[PDB]
Amino acid sequence: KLPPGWEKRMSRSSGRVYYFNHITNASQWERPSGGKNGQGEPARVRCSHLLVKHSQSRRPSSWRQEKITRTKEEALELINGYIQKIKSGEEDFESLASQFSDASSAKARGDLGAFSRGQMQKPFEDASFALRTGEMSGPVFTDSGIHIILRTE
């Protein structure tokens, strides 16, 4: 049971049971599903994203700063921080993407418009098509950096 990529898990050195998606890297306390079959994946999706680049990004540079020097671990720490902030309700995805995304799409609040498979980098693509409308991904790693993805359509 459970939608694609989803599996029930438990925290190490902890007992907290939760659900994790191996494709989007998303984690949540709520069970992802409460019967539709042969549904497959959407042929086209619309997603927004928040990208945090690091020194190993295929291009350690963005509109935010001339030279990206933070490491991958530092970027992941920032990504985890944005996720937690969005999940608490303290900040919203759009405002954080507009302010802190190292991607130029920040001017459009992270919105990338609609796309099909074969257009984006594989990891980003895989997470995007495994998301259901309104869902947000966990940390997704690509050559560009680390992203937080939100499917809007």
Swiss-Prot record:
Gene3D superfamilies: 2.20.70.10, 3.10.50.40. Residues 1-34 form the WW domain. This is Peptidyl-prolyl cis-trans isomerase NIMA-interacting 1. SUPFAM superfamilies: FKBP-like (SSF54534), WW domain (SSF51045). Its EC number is 5.2.1.8. It is found in: Nucleus; Nucleus speckle; Cytoplasm. Interacts with STIL. Interacts with KIF20B. Interacts with NEK6. Interacts (via WW domain) with PRKX. Interacts with BTK. Interacts (via PpiC domain) with DAPK1. Interacts with the phosphorylated form of RAF1. Interacts (via WW domain) with ATCAY; upon NGF stimulation. Interacts with PML (isoform PML-4). Interacts with BCL6. Interacts with FBXW7, disrupting FBXW7 dimerization and promoting FBXW7 autoubiquitination and degradation. Directly interacts with RBBP8/CtIP; this interaction depends upon RBBP8 phosphorylation. Peptidyl-prolyl cis/trans isomerase (PPIase) that binds to and isomerizes specific phosphorylated Ser/Thr-Pro (pSer/Thr-Pro) motifs. By inducing conformational changes in a subset of phosphorylated proteins, acts as a molecular switch in multiple cellular processes. Displays a preference for acidic residues located N-terminally to the proline bond to be isomerized. Regulates mitosis presumably by interacting with NIMA and attenuating its mitosis-promoting activity. Down-regulates kinase activity of BTK. GO terms for molecular function: beta-catenin binding; cis-trans isomerase activity; cytoskeletal motor activity; GTPase activating protein binding; mitogen-activated protein kinase kinase binding; peptidyl-prolyl cis-trans isomerase activity; phosphoprotein binding; phosphoserine residue binding. Residues 28-44 are annotated as: Disordered. Its main location: nucleus. GO terms for biological process: cellular response to hypoxia; negative regulation of amyloid-beta formation; negative regulation of cell motility; negative regulation of ERK1 and ERK2 cascade; negative regulation of protein binding; negative regulation of protein catabolic process; negative regulation of SMAD protein signal transduction; negative regulation of transforming growth factor beta receptor signaling pathway. Phosphorylation at Ser-61 by DAPK1 results in inhibition of its catalytic activity, nuclear localization, and its ability to induce centrosome amplification, chromosome instability and cell transformation. Ser-61 is dephosphorylated upon IL33-stimulation of dendritic cells.
